[PDB]
Structure 1
């Protein structure tokens, strides 16, 4: 009933005073939608002080996000202003994939093949949009376990961007022109800690040490613990330094491992 401590404009989403997860800018409460009767994540972020143009473009982006609809992607219902910004998405109650790994050291090859395949289908869906969507912050903490089946969904598109369709560019500007292969690189690291149950580059203290190891062709210490050679080769092709030498999602789905 209307225990709601927060308000919906049309009267569709009620905010309860039950904090389900606490973060940097994201304070997510437990909500409820009275139309599809689904429990809903009521998320509210710090007030964005944006101009009369960027307050505009957030609106058109929110209705883009409503067009997305994939079984491997957490659904985006609506968003609105209120006093800050409050986002409203499907509620995940089985936790994230990383916490699912924080309790066991070996994942069955069946579950790893199945869940990784569903992640690729999610990434592919985002990349086949017009304009294509690049997640840019893919990790096991942004992948959620859902349902009785135990399927996986990719959420938290906060650091995502649209695929952007000079002469003496500096080296860092050649790196600024990246693309969807940043999600493939992130997929390789996800599949790595799903088969090792160990955070990649845990032996490193900061990103500086991590960057110096990748460009020098030094993989995480945990990479030499992958028991399955076929899995080890897939991760290899995803975390290569040159983006042009990384696997494509189509080839990964057409890999013998994921067609098995």
Structure 2
């Protein structure tokens, strides 16, 4: 549990995220670097609190956080977590736009199934966007992190709010653009409150279109619950995580 136990391979993004290798057994991991040198005792206490709660989230569809490492010489805290070799979903959407190629329905069903189960676990314990959703090396989808395109009408003015955000994310995976677009937040808010959007492309089934649309209902109480989503006939065993 010291930084010297690991070698940095390279920087993933900029605190700063780095792919690292554990020296003892060669295991590939990543860590996030948090410089706490500019923080008050009160801000460091809330940091330690947040980090200890991260450690108890064990679920196949939530990024796994293993360890935390302190380096007082640099006032740097390192959060060691699993490595998701597939990167984030935002980059998958970007790729699709550039290649002018829509994503497979099977892929969208996997994201839906696995993110719905991550949310179910989050709700049971008590920010859904493509940049916070990660892919591993075997088609598994994991929620991480922890212009407001995905802002729900009610949050504009609740576990059903998360359903709205998943609807927006799944819609963007299919259309390669969010359901509501605009140049300012006030214009965005107008579009959102009206609750109209284009059908996802026709290569996607009426059944997939229907459930996404339901998640985007203006009335939180008409959006399907996590349990109602998972009962959908589209969602099969192979859409779930597999080790």
TM-score of the two chains, using structure 2 as the length reference:
0.78
Residue 2 of structure 2 corresponds to which residue in structure 1? 9
Equivalent residue for 2:84, pick from 83, 92, 95:
92
1:80-229 to structure 2, matched below 5 A, reads 80-82=69-71, 83=74, 84-104=76-96, 105-129=101-125, 132=126, 137-147=127-137, 149-157=138-146, 175=155, 179-196=158-175, 198-201=176-179, 203-219=181-197, 221=198, 223-226=199-202, 227-229=204-206
Equivalent residue for 1:30, pick from 19, 40, 45:
19
C-alpha distance in 2 between matches for 1:59 and 1:203: 38
Segment of structure 1 superposing worse, 227-236 or 80-89 = 80-89
Q: Is the 8 A contact 1:201 1:210 kept in 2?
A: no
How far residue 60 of structure 1 moved from its aligned partner, in angstroms, is 3.0
The 1:67–1:122 alpha-carbon spacing in structure 2 relative to 1, beyond 3 Å, is same
SS in 1 for 2:58: coil
The 1:186–1:46 alpha-carbon spacing in structure 2 relative to 1, beyond 3 Å, is farther
Segment of structure 1 superposing worse, 228-237 or 247-256 = 228-237
Residue 67 of structure 1 corresponds to which residue in structure 2? 56
SS in 2 for 1:32: strand
Q: Extract unaligned runs of 5+ from structure 1.
A: 1-7, 158-173
Larger relative helix fraction: 2
Q: Is the 8 A contact 1:48 1:85 kept in 2?
A: no
SS in 1 for 2:13: strand
Equivalent residue for 1:239, pick from 207, 210, 216:
216
SS in 2 for 1:205: coil
SS in 1 for 2:55: helix
C-alpha distance in 2 between matches for 1:58 and 1:246: 35
The 1:176–1:207 alpha-carbon spacing in structure 2 relative to 1, beyond 3 Å, is closer
C-alpha distance in 1 between matches for 2:47 and 2:200: 44
How far residue 41 of structure 1 moved from its aligned partner, in angstroms, is 1.5
* Higher relative contact order (Cα pairs below 8 Å, separated by 6+ residues): 2
How far residue 249 of structure 1 moved from its aligned partner, in angstroms, is 0.6
How far residue 248 of structure 1 moved from its aligned partner, in angstroms, is 0.7
Residue 56 of structure 1 corresponds to which residue in structure 2? 45
CA RMSD of aligned residues (A): 2.8
How far residue 151 of structure 1 moved from its aligned partner, in angstroms, is 1.3
